Coordinates of C-alpha atoms and ligand atoms in Angstrom, one line a residue:
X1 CA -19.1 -2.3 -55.6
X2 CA -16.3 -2.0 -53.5
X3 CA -15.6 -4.0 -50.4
X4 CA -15.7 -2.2 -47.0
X5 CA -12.9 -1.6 -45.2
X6 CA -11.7 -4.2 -42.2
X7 CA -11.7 -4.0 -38.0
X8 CA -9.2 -6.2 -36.9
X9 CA -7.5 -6.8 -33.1
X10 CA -4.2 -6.1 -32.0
X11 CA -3.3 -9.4 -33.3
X12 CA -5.0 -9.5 -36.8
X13 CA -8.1 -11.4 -36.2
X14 CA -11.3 -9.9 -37.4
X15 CA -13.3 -8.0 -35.2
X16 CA -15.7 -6.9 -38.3
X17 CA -15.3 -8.7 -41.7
X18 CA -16.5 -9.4 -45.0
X19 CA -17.8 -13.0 -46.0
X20 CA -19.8 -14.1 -48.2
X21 CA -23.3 -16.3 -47.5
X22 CA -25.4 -18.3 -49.4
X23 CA -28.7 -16.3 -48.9
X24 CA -32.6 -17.2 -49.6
X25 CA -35.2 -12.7 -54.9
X26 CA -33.1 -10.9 -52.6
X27 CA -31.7 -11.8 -49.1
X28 CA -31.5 -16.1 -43.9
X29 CA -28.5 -17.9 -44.6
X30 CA -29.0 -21.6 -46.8
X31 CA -37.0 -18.2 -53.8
X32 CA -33.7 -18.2 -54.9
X33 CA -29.7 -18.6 -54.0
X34 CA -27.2 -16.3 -54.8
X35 CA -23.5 -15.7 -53.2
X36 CA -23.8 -12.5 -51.5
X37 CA -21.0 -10.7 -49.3
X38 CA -21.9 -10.0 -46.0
X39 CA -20.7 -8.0 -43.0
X40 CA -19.7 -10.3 -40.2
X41 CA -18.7 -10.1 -36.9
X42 CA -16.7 -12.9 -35.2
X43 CA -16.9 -12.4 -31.7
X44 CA -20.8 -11.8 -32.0
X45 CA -22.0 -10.1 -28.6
X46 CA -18.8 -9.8 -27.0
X47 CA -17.8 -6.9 -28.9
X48 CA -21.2 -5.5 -30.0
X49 CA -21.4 -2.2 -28.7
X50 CA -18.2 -1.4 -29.4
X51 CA -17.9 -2.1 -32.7
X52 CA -21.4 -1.5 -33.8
X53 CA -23.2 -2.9 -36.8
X54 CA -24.0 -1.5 -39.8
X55 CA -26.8 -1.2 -42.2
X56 CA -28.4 0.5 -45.5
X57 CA -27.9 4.1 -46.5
X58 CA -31.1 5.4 -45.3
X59 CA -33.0 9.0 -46.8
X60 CA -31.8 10.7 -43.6
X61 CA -28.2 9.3 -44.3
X62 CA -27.5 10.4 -47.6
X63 CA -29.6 14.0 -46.9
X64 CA -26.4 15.1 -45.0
X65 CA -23.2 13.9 -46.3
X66 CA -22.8 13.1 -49.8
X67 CA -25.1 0.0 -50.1
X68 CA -24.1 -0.6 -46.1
X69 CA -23.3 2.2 -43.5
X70 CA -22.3 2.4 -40.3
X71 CA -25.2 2.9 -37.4
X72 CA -23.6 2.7 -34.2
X73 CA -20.0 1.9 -32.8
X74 CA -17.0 1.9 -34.2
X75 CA -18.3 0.8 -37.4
X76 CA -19.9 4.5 -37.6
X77 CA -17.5 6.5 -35.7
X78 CA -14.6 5.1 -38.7
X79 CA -17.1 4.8 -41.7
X80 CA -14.5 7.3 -43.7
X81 CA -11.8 5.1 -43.5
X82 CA -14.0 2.1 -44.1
X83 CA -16.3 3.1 -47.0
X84 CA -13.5 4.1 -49.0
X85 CA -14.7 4.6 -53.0
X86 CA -16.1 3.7 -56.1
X87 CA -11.3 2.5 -53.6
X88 CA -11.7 -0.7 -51.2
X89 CA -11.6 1.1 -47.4
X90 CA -8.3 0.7 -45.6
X91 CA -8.2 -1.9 -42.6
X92 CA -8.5 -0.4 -39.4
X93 CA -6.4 -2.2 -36.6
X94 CA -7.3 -1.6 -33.1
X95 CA -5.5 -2.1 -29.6
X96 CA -8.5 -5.0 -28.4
X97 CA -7.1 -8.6 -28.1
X98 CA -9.7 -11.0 -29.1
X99 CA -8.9 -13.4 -26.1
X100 CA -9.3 -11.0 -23.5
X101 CA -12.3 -9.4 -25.2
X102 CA -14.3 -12.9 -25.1
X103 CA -12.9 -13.7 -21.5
X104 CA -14.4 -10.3 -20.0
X105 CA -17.9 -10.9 -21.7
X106 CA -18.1 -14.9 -20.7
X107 CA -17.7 -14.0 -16.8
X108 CA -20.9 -11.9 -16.5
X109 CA -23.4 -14.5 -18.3
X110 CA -26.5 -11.8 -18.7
X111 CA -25.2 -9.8 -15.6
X112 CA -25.9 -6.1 -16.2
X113 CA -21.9 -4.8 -16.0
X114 CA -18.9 -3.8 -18.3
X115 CA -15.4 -4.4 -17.8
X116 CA -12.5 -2.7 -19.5
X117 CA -8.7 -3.9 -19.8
X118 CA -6.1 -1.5 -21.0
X119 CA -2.4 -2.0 -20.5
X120 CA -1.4 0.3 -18.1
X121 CA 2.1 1.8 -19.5
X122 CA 0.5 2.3 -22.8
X123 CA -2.6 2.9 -23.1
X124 CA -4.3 0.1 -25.3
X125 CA -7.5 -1.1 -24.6
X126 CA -7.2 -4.6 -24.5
X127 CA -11.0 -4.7 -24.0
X128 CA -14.2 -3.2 -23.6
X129 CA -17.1 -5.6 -22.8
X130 CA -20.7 -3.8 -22.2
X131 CA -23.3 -6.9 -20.5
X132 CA -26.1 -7.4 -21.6
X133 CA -25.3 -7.3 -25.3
X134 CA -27.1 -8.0 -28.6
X135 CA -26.0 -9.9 -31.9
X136 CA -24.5 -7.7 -34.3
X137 CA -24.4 -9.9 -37.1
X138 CA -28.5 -10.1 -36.9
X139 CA -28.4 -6.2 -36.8
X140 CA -26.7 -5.5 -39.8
X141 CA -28.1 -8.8 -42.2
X142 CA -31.9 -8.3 -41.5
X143 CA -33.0 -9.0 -37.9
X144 CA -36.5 -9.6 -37.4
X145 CA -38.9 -7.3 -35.4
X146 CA -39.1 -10.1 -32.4
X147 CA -35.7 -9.9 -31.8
X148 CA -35.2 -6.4 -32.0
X149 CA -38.4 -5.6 -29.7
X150 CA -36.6 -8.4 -27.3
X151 CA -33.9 -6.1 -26.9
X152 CA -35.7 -2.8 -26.8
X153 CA -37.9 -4.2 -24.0
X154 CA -34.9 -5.5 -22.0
X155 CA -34.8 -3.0 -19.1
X156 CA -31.1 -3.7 -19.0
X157 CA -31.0 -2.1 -22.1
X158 CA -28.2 -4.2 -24.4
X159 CA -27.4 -1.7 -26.5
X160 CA -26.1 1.1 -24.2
X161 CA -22.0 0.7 -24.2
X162 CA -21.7 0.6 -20.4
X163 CA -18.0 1.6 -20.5
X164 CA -18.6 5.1 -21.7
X165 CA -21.6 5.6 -19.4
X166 CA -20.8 7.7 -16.3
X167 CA -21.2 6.3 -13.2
X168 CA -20.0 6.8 -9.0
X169 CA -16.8 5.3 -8.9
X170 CA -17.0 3.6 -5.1
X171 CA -15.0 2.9 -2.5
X172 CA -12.1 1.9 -5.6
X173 CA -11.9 6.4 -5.5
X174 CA -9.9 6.2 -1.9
X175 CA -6.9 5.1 -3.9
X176 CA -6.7 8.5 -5.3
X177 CA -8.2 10.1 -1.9
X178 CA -5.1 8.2 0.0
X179 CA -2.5 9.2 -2.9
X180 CA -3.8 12.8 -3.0
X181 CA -3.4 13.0 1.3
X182 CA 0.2 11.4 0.9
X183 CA 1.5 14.0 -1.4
X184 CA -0.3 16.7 0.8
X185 CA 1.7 15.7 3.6
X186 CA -1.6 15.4 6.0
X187 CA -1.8 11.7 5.4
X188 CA 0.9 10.0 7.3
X189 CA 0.8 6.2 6.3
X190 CA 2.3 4.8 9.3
X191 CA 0.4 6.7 11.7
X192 CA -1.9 5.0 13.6
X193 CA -5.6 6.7 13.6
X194 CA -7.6 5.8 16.9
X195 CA -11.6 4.7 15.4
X196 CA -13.9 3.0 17.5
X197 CA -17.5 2.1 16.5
X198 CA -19.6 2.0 12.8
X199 CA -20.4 5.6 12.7
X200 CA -18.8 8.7 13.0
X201 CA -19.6 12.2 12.3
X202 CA -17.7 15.6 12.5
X203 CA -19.5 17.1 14.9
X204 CA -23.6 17.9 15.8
X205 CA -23.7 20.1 12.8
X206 CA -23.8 16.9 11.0
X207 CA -27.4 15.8 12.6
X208 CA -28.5 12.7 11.4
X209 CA -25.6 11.9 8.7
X210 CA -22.2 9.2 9.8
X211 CA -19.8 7.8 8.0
X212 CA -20.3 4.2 8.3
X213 CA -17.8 1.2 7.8
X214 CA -17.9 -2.5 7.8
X215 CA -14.8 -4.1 9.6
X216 CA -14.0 -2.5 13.2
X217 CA -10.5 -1.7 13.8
X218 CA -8.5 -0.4 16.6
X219 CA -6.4 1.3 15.2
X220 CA -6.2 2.0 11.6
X221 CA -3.3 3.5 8.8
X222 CA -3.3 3.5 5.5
X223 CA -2.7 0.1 4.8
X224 CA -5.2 -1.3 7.1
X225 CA -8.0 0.7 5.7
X226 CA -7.5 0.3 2.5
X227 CA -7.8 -3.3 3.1
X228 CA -10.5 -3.0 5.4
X229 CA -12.8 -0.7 3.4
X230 CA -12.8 1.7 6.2
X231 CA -14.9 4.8 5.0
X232 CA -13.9 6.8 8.5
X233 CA -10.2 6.6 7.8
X234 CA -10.7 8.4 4.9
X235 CA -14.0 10.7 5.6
X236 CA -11.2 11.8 8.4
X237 CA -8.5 11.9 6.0
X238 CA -10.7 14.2 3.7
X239 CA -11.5 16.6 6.3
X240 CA -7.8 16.8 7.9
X241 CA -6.7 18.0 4.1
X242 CA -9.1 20.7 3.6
X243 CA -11.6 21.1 0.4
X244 CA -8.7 22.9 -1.0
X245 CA -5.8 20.4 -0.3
X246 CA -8.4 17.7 -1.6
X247 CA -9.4 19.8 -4.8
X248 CA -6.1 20.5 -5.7
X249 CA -5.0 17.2 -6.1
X250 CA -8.1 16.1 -7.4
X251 CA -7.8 18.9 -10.4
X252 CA -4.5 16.9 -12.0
X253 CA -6.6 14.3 -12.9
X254 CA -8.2 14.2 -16.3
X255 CA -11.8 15.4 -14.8
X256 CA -14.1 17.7 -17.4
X257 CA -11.6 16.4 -19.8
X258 CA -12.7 14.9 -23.2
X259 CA -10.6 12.2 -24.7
X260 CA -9.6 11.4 -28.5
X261 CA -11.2 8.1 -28.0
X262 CA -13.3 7.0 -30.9
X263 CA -16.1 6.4 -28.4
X264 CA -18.4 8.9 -27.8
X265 CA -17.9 9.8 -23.8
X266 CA -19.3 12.5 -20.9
X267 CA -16.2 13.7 -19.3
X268 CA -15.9 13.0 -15.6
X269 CA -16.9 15.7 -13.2
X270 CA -16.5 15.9 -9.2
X271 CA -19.7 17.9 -8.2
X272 CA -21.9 20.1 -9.7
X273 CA -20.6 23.0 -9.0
X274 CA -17.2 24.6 -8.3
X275 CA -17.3 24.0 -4.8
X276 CA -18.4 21.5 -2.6
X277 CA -21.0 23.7 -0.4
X278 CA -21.2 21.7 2.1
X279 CA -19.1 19.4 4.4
X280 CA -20.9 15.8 4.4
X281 CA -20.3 16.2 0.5
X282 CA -16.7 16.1 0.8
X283 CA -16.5 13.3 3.5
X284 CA -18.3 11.3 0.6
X285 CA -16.5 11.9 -2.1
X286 CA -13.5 11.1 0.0
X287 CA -14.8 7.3 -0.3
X288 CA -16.1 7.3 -3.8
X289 CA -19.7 8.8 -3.2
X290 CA -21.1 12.9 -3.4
X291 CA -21.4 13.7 -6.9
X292 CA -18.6 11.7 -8.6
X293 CA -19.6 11.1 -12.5
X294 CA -16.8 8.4 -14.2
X295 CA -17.2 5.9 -16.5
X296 CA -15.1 2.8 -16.8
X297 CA -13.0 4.1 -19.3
X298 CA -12.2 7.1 -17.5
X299 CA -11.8 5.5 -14.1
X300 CA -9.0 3.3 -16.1
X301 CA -7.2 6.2 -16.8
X302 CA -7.3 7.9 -13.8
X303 CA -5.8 4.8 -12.1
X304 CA -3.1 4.0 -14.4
X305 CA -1.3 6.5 -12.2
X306 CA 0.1 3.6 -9.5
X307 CA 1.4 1.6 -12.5
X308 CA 3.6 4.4 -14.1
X309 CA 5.3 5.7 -10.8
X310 CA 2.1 8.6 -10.8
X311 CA 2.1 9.5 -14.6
X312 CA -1.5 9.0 -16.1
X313 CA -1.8 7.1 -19.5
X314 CA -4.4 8.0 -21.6
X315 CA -6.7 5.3 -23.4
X316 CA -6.0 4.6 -26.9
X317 CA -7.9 2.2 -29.1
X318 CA -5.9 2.2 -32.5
X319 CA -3.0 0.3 -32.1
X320 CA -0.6 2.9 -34.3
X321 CA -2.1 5.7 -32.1
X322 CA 1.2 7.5 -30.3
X323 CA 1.9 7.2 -26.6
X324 CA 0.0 9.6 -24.6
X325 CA 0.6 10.9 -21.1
X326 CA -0.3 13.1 -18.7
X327 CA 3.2 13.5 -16.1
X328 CA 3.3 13.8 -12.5
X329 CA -0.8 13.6 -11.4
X330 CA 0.3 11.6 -8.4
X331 CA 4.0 11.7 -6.7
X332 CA 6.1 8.5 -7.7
X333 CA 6.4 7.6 -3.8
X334 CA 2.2 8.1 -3.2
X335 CA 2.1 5.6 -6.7
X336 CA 3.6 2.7 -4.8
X337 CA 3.0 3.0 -1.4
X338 CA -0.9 2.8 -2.9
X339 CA -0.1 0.1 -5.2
X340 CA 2.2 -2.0 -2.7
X341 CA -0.9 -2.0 0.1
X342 CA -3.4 -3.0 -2.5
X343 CA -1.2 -6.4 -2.7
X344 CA -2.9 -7.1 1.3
X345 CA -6.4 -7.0 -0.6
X346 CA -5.9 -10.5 -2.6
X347 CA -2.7 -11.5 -0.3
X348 CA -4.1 -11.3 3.1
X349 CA -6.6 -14.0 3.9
X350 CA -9.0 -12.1 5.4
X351 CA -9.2 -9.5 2.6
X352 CA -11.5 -9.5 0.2
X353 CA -10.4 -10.7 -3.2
X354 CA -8.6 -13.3 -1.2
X355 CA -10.4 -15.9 -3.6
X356 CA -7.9 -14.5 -6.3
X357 CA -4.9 -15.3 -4.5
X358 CA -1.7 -16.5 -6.3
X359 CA 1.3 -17.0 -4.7
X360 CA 3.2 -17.3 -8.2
X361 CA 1.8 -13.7 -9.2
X362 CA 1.5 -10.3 -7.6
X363 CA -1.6 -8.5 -7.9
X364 CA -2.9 -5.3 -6.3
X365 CA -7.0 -4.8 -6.1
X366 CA -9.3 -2.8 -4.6
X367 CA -13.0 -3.9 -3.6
X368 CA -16.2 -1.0 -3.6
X369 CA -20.0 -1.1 -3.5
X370 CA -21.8 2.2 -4.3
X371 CA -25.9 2.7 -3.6
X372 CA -26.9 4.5 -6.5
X373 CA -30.0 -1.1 -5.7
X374 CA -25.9 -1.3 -5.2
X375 CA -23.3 -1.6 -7.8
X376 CA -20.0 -3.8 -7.3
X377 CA -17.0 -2.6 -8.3
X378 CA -13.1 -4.5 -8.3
X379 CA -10.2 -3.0 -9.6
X380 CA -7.0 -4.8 -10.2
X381 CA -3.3 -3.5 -11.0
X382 CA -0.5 -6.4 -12.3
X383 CA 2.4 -5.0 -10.2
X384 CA 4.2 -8.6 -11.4
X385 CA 5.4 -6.3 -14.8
X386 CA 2.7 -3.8 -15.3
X387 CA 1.7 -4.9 -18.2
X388 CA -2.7 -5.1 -17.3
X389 CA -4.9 -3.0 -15.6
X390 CA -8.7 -4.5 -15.1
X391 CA -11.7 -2.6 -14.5
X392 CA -15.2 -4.8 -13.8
X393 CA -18.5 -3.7 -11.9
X394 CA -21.6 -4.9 -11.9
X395 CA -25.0 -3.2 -11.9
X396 CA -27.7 -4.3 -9.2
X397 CA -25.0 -6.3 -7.1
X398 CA -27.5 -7.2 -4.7
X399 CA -29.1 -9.6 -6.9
X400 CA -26.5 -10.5 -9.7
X401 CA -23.8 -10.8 -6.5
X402 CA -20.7 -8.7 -6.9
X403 CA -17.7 -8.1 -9.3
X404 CA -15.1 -10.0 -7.4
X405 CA -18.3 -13.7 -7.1
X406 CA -17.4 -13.6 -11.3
X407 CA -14.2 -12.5 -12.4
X408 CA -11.5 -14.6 -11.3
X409 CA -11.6 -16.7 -14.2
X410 CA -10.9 -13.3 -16.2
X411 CA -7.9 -12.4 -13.6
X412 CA -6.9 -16.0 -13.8
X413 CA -6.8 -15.6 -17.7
X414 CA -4.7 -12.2 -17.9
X415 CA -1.9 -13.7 -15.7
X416 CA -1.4 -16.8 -17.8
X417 CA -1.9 -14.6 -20.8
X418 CA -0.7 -10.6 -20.4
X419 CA 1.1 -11.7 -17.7
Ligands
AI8_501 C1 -16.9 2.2 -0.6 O1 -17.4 1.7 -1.6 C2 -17.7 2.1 0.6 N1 -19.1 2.1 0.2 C3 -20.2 2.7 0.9 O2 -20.0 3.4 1.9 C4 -21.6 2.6 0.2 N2 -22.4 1.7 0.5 O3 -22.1 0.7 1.4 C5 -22.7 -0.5 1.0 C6 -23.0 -1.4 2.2 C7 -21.9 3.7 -0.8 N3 -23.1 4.4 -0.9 S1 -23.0 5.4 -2.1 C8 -21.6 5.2 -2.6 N4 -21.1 5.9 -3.8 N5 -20.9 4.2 -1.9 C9 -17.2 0.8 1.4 N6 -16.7 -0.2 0.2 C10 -17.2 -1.6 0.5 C11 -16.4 -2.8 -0.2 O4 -16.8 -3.2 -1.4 O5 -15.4 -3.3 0.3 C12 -18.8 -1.9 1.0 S2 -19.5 -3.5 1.0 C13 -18.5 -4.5 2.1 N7 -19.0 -5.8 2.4 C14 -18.0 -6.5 3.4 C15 -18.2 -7.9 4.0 C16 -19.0 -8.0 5.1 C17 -19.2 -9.3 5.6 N8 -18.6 -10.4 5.1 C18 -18.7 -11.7 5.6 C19 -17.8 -10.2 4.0 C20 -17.6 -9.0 3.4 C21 -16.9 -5.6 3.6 S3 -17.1 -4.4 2.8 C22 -19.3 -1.0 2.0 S4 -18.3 0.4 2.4

């Protein structure tokens, strides 16, 4: 009977653990009594699709590879390094900080979302929160067939690991759009673009299809729209650079790629098929709609680019893991002059993560809804010292209100904190 190997955080603190319960004969926690060792998990639901639970060696288990294995999470994904013999398994330190992993989870409060914080010059995942979520200590010491059934009849399904699900990135894509027209040369960021009413098409081969926006501006540059979540500015954009300027710099990125992340992940795509085939399709996925497939994970890595002057970090969730990077996906200058207008959309008063302002802190966001019911999304770049990149949406936004309503008590935590 050897003792299973350990998860801890960047930090040391357990993330899944061995302790040992008084149990009521074999095993709830006090016939009979006995000391029993058990697996435990200390932040509970906050990190329970990631790391999983575990259970018994099943028929099915032992018929391929030849008392507790891992089911789901990381707990399965590293049982080799865990199990060990019968050798105690080797502890198994990961990037996540417990701090930020509880903060991430406490903002959405049954919400269906995720959220995922990485540090944007390195790679670690600082956290990866799925909502809603389950107990994993229950799962892996004997849960009861109410619970369980609870949680299979939940139609927000707690047990899917929202941050490796693939979904339309939003209006949070036109920081890529805008970085990809500024290296192009067909974006000019000071020019000043004349748009005037909520709709605008092409031309009459577009029938009854318009790019729509929100906030009517006279006339509109790259800051301005940005801030303004102006879907014409960049639907425009789009079509002045051409599905081949557009797909060019849209190929750099890390799309159809799969990742040496421990967590099983659909690489990102951009459309079905090779080409667009059409030209309303590429107007929206100028602003985040048409086909686009990332997940949360994936949509931090792709916008890592604007804190590492336009090199892309890739994820890593092992804290030992080596540094890995992908140079040059964006220009150094489009990097910045993205990042440094994303400052207006918390800065300026009328923008629209306003209600995060700090004047003691400088913090670049970027708001987006997508209709898949609507979806929230916010992301956030620390351009104080690049040292945290956030990630937060939030399924059926039109009921559970949007990303930005809930997390400024996580941004507010990450500036005091990460810093
Ligand atoms: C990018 O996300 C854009 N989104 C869309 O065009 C889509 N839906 O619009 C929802 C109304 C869409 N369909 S499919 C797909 N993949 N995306 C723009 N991004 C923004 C945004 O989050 O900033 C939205 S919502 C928005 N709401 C306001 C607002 C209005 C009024 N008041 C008082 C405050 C705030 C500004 S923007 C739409 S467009």
């Amino acid at each position: 009977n050897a003792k299973r190997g350990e998860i801890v955080d960047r930090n040391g603190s357990g993330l899944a653990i061995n302790k040992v319960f008084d149990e009521v004969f074999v095993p709830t926690v006090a016939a009979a009594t006995k000391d029993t060792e058990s697996r435990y998990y200390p932040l509970g639901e906050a990190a329970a699709q990631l790391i999983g639970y575990t259970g018994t060696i099943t028929a099915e288990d032992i018929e391929k590879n030849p008392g507790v294995i891992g089911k789901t999470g990381l707990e399965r994904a590293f049982d080799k390094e865990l199990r060990g013999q019968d050798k105690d398994g080797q502890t198994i330190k990961l990037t996540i900080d417990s701090g930020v992993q509880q903060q991430a989870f406490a903002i959405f409060d049954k919400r269906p979302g995720s959220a995922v914080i990485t540090d944007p010059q390195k790679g670690d995942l600082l956290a990866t929160v799925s909502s809603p979520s389950y107990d994993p200590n229950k799962m892996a010491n004997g849960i009861s067939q109410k619970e369980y059934d609870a949680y299979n009849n939940n139609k927000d399904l707690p047990f899917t690991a929202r941050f490796a699900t693939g979904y339309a990135p939003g209006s949070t894509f036109k920081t890529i759009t805008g970085a990809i027209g500024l290296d192009a040369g067909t974006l000019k960021p000071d020019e000043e673009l004349e748009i005037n009413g909520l709709k605008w098409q092409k031309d009459k081969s577009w029938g009854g299809y318009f790019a729509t926006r929100v906030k009517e501006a006279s006339p509109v540059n790259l800051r301005t729209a940005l801030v303004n979540s102006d879907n014409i500015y960049f639907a425009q954009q789009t079509l002045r650079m051409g599905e081949d300027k557009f797909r060019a710099g849209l190929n750099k990125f890390i799309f159809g790629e799969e990742l040496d992340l421990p967590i099983a992940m659909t690489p990102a795509q951009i459309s079905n098929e090779d080409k667009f085939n059409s030209e309303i399709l590429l107007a929206d996925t100028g602003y985040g709609q048409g086909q686009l497939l990332i997940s949360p994970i994936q949509q931090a890595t792709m916008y890592s680019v604007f804190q590492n002057n336009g090199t892309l970090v890739y994820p890593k969730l092992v804290l030992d893991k080596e540094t890995k990077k992908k140079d040059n996906v964006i220009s150094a200058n489009a990097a910045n002059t993205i990042a440094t207008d994303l400052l207006g959309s918390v800065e300026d008063p009328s923008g629209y993560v306003y209600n995060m302002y700090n004047p003691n802190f400088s913090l670049a966001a970027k708001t987006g809804t997508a209709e898949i019911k609507e979806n929230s999304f916010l992301l956030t770049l620390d351009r104080s010292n690049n040292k945290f990149l956030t990630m937060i949406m939030v399924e059926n936004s039109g009921e559970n209100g949007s990303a930005t309503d809930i997390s400024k008590p996580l941004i507010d935590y990450l500036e005091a904190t990460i810093k």
